[model samples]
Structure formats: structure tokens, C-alpha cells
Target: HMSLAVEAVKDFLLKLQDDICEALEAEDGQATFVEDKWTREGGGGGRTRVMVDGAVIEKGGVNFSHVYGKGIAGCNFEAMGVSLVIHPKNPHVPTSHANVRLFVAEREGKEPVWWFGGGFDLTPYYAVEEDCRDFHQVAQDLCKPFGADVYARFKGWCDEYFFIPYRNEARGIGGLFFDDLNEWPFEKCFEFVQAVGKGYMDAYIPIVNRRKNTPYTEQQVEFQEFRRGRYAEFNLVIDRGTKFGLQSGGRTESILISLPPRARWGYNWQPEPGTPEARLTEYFLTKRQWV
Candidate 1:
């Protein structure tokens, strides 16, 4: 018989995958995600849905996966998660990402251990203070009911975790990043996870609607592509999830789906002072409390 935790968490992640994909399709209007179901060689598998060339989004993916394996820290392990990334065609509309996951490990002589992890973040080519504030405010509101310090704790974690030490900059205006979140009782932790999952769309959809139709020049498009190089750098070189998945024999395409459809780096590139691009590097990308 499956444990209650297993049943509950798995159902939530699967439903999250469906809910997000449906909403995004409605928002995108012109394109729909094509689904692919595949099995893992060792144990379980997943549904990977990807959309390309949408009216709003240029490329995106909403994926749900469940996999089990043996001998992780001397225990049998199982993991389930819903992960998504949306790269909008409009430079004014920011790229967004979110993920929620549950992991359980069982050992013969010890009690089963389980934990939850996930959060969302925004990456904008052009900085909008109102949008940044709204995103962080929604995140703060979600964590407020849990504790007085929950938002600050996780916000700090997001800022700290997503930073590129070499570049001395953050990935974007952070939302929330957390992992190994098993301290509270199971039910309470699960409730918190659900809150984060539900809040993601609320945080991102408005920003998309606000900026999707905003006009931009070729220069803006070039800047967006140039900035996206940092996204590539972080995922390939700094992200733990990417490393973990590859090391553990996870599906390659799904693992790399977080990457943008196109990105480029320029040698010795620097925006002119006082330009919005410079502001993004000088002010918006720096660490600050938006909410």
C-alpha cells in the first residue's frame, strides 16, 4: 500500500502540471504544448510537454516526473515534481520559471524520510519596478500565513542561492528558492508547498499580460539574447538540479528544457551608462528587498 504522503504529494504535482499548462496555453493563444510520455530505464518516467512559437511565449515547457532509484545514501529513493519554464517572445515580457518537488527515501531499519523543494523566479530584459514589487509581494503574502519571518528567510535564500559568485550578480529579481524543507510537520509543510505552487501563476501571469504587446527594437532583442547567456551559464555551470539530474541518469532533453531557445554571449560587452540595459546590471540585478 502506498503511504498517504506519497499519494497526496504525487497527486498535487501531477495536477499542478496540468493546471499550469492549461493556463499558459490560454495565455499563449496561438500555440499549444505537445506532450511526450517516456519511461526511465531504471524505474519510473514522466510527461514532458513543450510549446514553441506561441503568440506570447517563444518557447516553454511544463513537465511532471516521477522516478525511483536504489542506493541513494543507502536508502531506496523516490522523487516527484512539476517543473516549468516560459520564454516569451516579447522583450518586455520577462521569462519565468517555477518548480515543486517531493522526495522520499526509505531505509530498512530507519523511519522513511521525506522533504519538499521548489520556488519561482523572474528574468526580465527590461526592468519594471512595479512588476518586480508585485512578484515579491505575492511571494511575501504566500509565506506570511506560515510565519513572520518565512518570507524574509526564503527571499534571502533565493537571492543568495541564485547569485553567480564570479559575476557578483543575481539570476534575476528573485521570488523564492528553498530546499530540504522538512522541518515542520508533514501536513503543514505540504500546505506551504501548495501555497507556493498556487501562487506562481498569480505572480507571473499579470506581468506577462502587461508586457506581451509592448514594442521593442532589434537592439532590445539583441540585449535580451545577450542577457539570456547568464541564464545558460547558471543552469549549466551553477544549478544543482541540472548536475544532479545528469549525474543520476535523468532524461537529457527534460533536464535541459530550462534553457532558452536561443541565447548568445558577446565578448567585452557593456551597455552605455544611463541606459536601461546598464540599469539592469547596475541596479535591478543587484540584491535588494522589493517587497
Candidate 2:
């Protein structure tokens, strides 16, 4: 089931990317997977798909990386294992990411391997309360079957997972997340993966439909580029998955491909008070939504 689920997610996301691009009439929005070189420290490798300069998308990548080692240089925890990150282009359409990995144990034959993590969040350049509501409600409804508290639990997890503590704000509007999710056991974890992956279509497609065609001012585009700088900071300075890849001999191009082609930083950026750009910034930090 593990291999089966992985294949399913890979296929689903690839189709989603293609569909989104085709719908947007994008030049090259399809995902292209690349085989990454393996490291001696662990078993198995990864598939990295990066899309860029499309009529619809600006830049993004969907990555599935598996690794193992005693310890990596920068993880906050002392666990050695696999990790994943998905970044999307077009700030109008929010970015999504999630990861699930098993930690190391010195046991033979199918040891009690525990899993940690998986979640997807929204990062929209334009604030749409309805999008946030819809995104969270789908995840919440998915979890309600298990426990009333499940969605709330994971939502908090997402908020923390994508945080850049120094910035004192979340990476974007929150979605769902969990760590050491092995508490639910392997069978259930696989079930959760399917639910979450399936949820992406309903959770995000309408939101994109709302904004994909909305005309943007030059300033809006510029602000979107500026917002991407924050994303770059989180990935390069703060993302544990990225740091682990670099330390363990992962390909530089694959690791960096998710970054946008253009990002801007000045002494400081202070958008006009109460402007749409400012509203977007406020939207990212706020917790509640209409959905």
C-alpha cells in the first residue's frame, strides 16, 4: 500500500498540474519529473518536478525525497529520514506542501517504523476569505470522521510547520499538518494520505477559478514578486527539508528549482496602508475565515 499510495499521489498531482496549466492556457505548466541521485547514507532517492515561465504559473516544483542518515546538520529534531516540499507558482493560486517520512530504527524485517508529517497550506498573494474557508473546511470535514478534534489539531500543526519564527508570522494562510503522525499507525496513515491528496482538488480548484482571471495591476504583480522573497527566505534560510537535502548530497538544481525566477528585496517594503497589498499581508497572518 505504501508504494501504491506514493504512486497515486504522484499521478494525482501530475494530473492536477497539467489540468491547471491547460485550463489557464499556460505555455508549460505541466510537471516534469527528474530522477535524483541517491546517497549512500540511506536507501531510495526521489522524483523532482519543476515548472516555470508558464502562461499560468510563474514557478513551482513537486518533490518526493527519501533519505536516511544518523543526523543531518540543521533539523531541529534528531531524526533521520525522508521529507517533501511542494511549491506552486502564481501567488493568485496558493502554494501547497506536505511530507511524510519514517524515522530510523535499528531492527531487522519491518521494524516498528514511525511516521512523521504530511500537510498542505495556502499561500495566496491576494486575500480571498472564501478560499481560506473552503480549504480548511474540506480538511476539517475529512478529519471529522476520525475525531472532532482532528482538524483543529492538524490546523495548528500547519500553522507552526510553515512558520519562520523570526518573522513572527506564518508562511501563509494555514491548512493542515501533523508530526510523528505514526500515532495513528501505518494503515490509517495511508488512508489519511489518500484523503488529503484527494482533498486538494476540491479545496483549491475553485479558489484558482476565482482569481486566475482577475486582472492585476502592475503594483499587484510587483507585490506578488516581493511576497515571493519571503518564500525564498523560508526555503533557503529556514526549511528543514531543504537544509537536509543540501547536507546529504542532494542535487542543487533540484533543491532550488521551486524558487521563483524573480524576487525583490529593498531596504524594506511598506505597502500603502489599507491597500489591497496590505490587505493580503493581513490575510496571511489572520487565523479565522468564512469557509
Q: Say which candidate scores most in lDDT.
A: 1
Query: Candidate 1: worst 10 consecutive residues by lDDT?
Result: 1-10
Q: What is the Cα-based TM-score of model 1?
A: 0.97
Per-residue CA lDDT of model 2 for 1-291, tens digit only, reads: 244544544454445444433433333335443334444444445555555555455555555555444432322222322223433355566665544444433333443344656667778777677778888888888887667788888888777778888877678888887766776756676567556655655676567666666666667778878887888899888877689768867767767765667788877676678877888666556664434
Model 1 segments more than 4 A misplaced: none
Model 2 ranges with Cα > 4 A deviation: 1-43, 66-91, 100-110, 288-291
lDDT of each: 0.89, 0.61
TM-score of each: 0.97, 0.77
- In model 2, state the lDDT of residue 194: 55
| Candidate 2 lDDT score relative to the true structure | 0.61
Which candidate wins on TM-score? 1
